[PDB]
Design a protein around this ligand. Structure first.
Ligand SMILES: NS(=O)(=O)c1cccc(NC(=O)NCCNCc2ccccc2)c1
Ligand SMILES: [Zn+2]
Length: 257
């Protein structure tokens, strides 16, 4: 049972998941002096249908907002991709204090949290379960979240957490378009990488937005007030769930800008 504390956390994951020491691990530090501008990168195109929003779930280490993924009502196109990728989930990472919490860093700078919008390749594969281990199977948009003014676009998500306070609790989460959470500019970096927690499959093409979005200290506190224990047990707040950055191992981070 992997986790984020010192006994089961990122620096121990390799004992159970050897790919943690792989060549395409995520997240990474994006050194902007070493990025390579790619004129062939197309703009990112997201077209999400709010009716595909399904459920919010406390998964112990985090919470997930899941989407109906039976058809192409909600898709990501463009960027480095030739195929269409079908939305299936968004979630966040945060840290114990505001000084850290993002997974990716930019020129060594740690942000307070990070939003992940995850999709799977429905052009080549028939299900998330099939796509999840394929090198071209997953596409995840990462948005760095900078502490500052309260972000009103997070409201529906934050209001839902009171119904999923403890591990395993699930509740309907409907009529929501998560493209409303993205920054106004979709200038981006991209690199081949991995899921940032077990099973750490090197199946993710990362799209990291250049522009951050805001989040307030109190909104971050709502994340950390989620409980990792099951109802009835001693309360264990979800203090943090971000993985440290990993070596590029010769990968190249491309810039759309
Ligand atoms: N932080 S992330 O790298 O952007 C990222 C992106 C997408 C999914 C996850 N994790 C989870 O969805 N966990 C809950 C269910 N686990 C089964 C599973 C295995 C492989 C792929 C999807 C689902 C993490
Ligand atoms: Zn994530």
């Amino acid at each position: 049972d992997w986790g984020y504390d010192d006994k089961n956390g990122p620096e121990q994951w390799s004992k159970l998941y050897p790919i943690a020491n792989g060549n395409n691990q995520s997240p990474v530090d994006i050194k902007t002096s070493e990025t390579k501008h790619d004129t062939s990168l197309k703009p990112i195109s997201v077209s999400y249908n709010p009716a595909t929003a399904k459920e919010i779930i406390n998964v112990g280490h985090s919470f997930h907002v899941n989407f109906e993924d039976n058809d192409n009502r909600s898709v990501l196109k463009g960027g480095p991709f030739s195929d269409s990728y079908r939305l299936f989930q968004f979630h966040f990472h945060w840290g114990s204090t505001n000084e850290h919490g993002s997974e990716h860093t930019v020129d060594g700078v740690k942000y307070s949290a990070e939003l992940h919008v995850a999709h799977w390749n429905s052009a080549k594969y028939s299900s998330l379960a099939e796509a999840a281990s394929k090198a071209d199977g997953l596409a995840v948009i990462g948005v760095l979240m900078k502490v500052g003014e309260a972000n009103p676009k997070l409201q529906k998500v934050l209001d839902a957490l009171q119904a999923i306070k403890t591990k395993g609790k699930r509740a309907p989460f409907t009529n929501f378009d998560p493209s409303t959470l993205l920054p106004s500019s979709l200038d981006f970096w991209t690199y081949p990488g991995s899921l940032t927690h077990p099973p750490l499959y090197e199946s993710v093409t990362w799209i990291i937005c250049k522009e951050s979005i805001s989040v307030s200290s109190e909104q971050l506190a709502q994340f950390r007030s989620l409980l990792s224990n099951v109802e009835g047990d001693n309360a264990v707040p979800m203090q943090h769930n971000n993985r440290p950055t990993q070596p590029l191992k010769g990968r190249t981070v491309r810039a759309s800008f």
